[PDB]
């Protein structure tokens, strides 16, 4: 029984948390009562199981028992359509084809959030169908959210009424608080979206990679012999976790914790604080510790890879071993490099050897081959300097309509929503990396926007328009980045005609907030944008500033929110004229 073997290492509380969020995962467009009954229904089934281990099909494979369930209510196509055919499928994959109907771009309205005095009530009345709820909503939204990392998000969601309910003032103490989770869980969620892109769509090879490279910068003292270990094992939980088996990603996680903590004087000298805590506060810290570290007297690289005459013979043997031996040795000497860049090291050095060693003196054609890195690594340097220097002279909002108008050219045909999204996201880096000394800079900047640059792929993925998308998408995941920034205005795009429905303006943009005004206003550079291309000098600006005069007007203009249809129709006319 597998059921009943999650259930005892997980135990009840959990098991029925990784349920949830595996149920909310699939039919995001489910009501929370079927989910919770479905959970239950499952739950109970288990806890036969672990008594009698043979009774009904707890002989099963978790995917036959859950598939059923959720087949229980996915045959009603009017509601979910296209789910109903793979109901219809076997076993070898039914699940396939759930996990290819995960939507990235829940059309499932707002999550609004009511004040203060009624969270904290609902809180309190009932903490679990409260705490329930909050992963079910944040599941359904996040097809790919780490979930024992969701697990980590509820227990301090929790901590965040548990505690400022009880305050003088609780919308003072909660909404900042709340207003952080937000935040840190769309990144734990765009981190993960990128790892379970890498297994699925370059492979683990791809993935192995990354991770060796990452931890080598993590545990510079640790032997290349441990860092494999570690990179087979956290490989695993993630390949897990992408496909959907929750229970055994979260279980799995949680050995690898264990087993990092106890050999820990092998691997980092700064675990030492994250090893003294609960199991899920100890795993989010590891998974978040600061390199380590690195080793004092360390031999130069050219003695073994480049200056050996063994080389051509090595890389014959084991390649790779061997490459991953070089990725490990370049990484741990180089905490000041993004993860990226040394993945874009590894990937020339592996195309030199393998022209090279073929060569009649291999030692003489891949002796100069640091002397094809050096471009690589000044490119992304100066990126990053002349785009921060940018930055802190415009500020976010000014930064982020500059790569909206900068990258609404490169790819006219993606539609407006992502651009804005994607474009909003770039220019956060700012914000997040400009403020950092070089040596933290690039890993920040260069990172970070990998990230973001997968959020488009999928997105895109999703509904293909560009085709030059999809090329940068596709062609090489490490250089995706490159890819963009070589980019430039597509000079194949005819421009869209204007009409009424393209950008409709009603009086009800005075109620929202700073926020959702000014992504009104950027959604409204980019419609722009697409109608007029290349004419447009900076006097985007002008028309733009006009836009904003607009709205200023008609919302403290007392008359019915009418000047907003009339001066609606008034301000076109001046935007064509420019």
Known sequence: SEVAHRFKDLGEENFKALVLIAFAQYLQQCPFEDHVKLVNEVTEFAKTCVADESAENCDKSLHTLFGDKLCTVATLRETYGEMADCC???????????????????????????????????????????????????????????????????????????????????????????????????????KQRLKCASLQKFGERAFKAWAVARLSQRFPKAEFAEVSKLVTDLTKVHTECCHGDLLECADDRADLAKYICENQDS???????????????????????????????????????????????????????????????????????????LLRLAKTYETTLEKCCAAADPHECYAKVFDEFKPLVEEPQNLIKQNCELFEQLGEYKFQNALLVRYTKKVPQVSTPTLVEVS?????????????????????????????????????????????????????????????????????????????????????????????????????????????????????????????????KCCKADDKETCFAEEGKKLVAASQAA
């Open 267 to 341: 691997i980092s000298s700064k675990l030492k604080e994250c090893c003294e805590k609960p199991l899920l506060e100890k795993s989010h810290c590891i998974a978040e510790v600061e390199n380590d570290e690195m080793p004092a007297d360390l031999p130069s690289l050219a003695a073994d890879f480049v200056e050996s005459k063994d080389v051509c013979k090595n890389y014959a043997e084991a390649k790779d071993v061997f490459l991953g031996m070089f990725l490990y040795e370049y990484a741990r000497r180089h905490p000041d490099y993004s993860v990226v860049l």
């Open 424 to 552: 909003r996201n770039l220019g956060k880096v700012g914000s997040k990396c400009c403020k950092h000394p070089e040596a933290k800079r690039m890993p920040c900047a260069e990172d970070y926007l990998s990230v973001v640059l997968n959020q488009l792929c999928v997105l895109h993925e999703k509904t293909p328009v560009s085709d030059r998308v999809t090329k940068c998408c596709t062609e090489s995941l490490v250089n995706r980045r490159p890819c963009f920034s070589a980019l430039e205005v597509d000079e194949t795009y005819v421009p869209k005609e204007f009409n009424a429905e393209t950008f409709t303006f009603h009086a009800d943009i005075c109620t929202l907030s700073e926020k959702e005004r000014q992504i009104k206003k950027q959604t409204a550079l980019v419609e722009l944008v697409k109608h007029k291309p290349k004419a447009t000098k900076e006097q985007l600006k002008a028309v733009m500033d006009d836009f904003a005069a607009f709205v200023e």
């Open 88 to 190: 219809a499928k076997q076993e070898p994959e039914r699940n396939e084809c759930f996990l290819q109907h995960k939507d990235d771009n829940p059309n499932l309205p707002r999550l609004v959030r009511p004040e203060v005095d009624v969270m904290c009530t609902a809180f309190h009345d009932n903490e679990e169908t409260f705490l329930k709820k909050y992963l079910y909503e944040i599941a359904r939204r996040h097809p790919y959210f780490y979930a024992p990392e969701l697990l980590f998000f509820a227990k301090r969601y929790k901590a965040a009424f548990t505690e400022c309910c009880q305050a003088a003032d609780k919308a003072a103490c909660l909404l900042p608080k709340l207003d952080e989770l937000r935040d840190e869980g769309k990144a734990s969620s765009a």
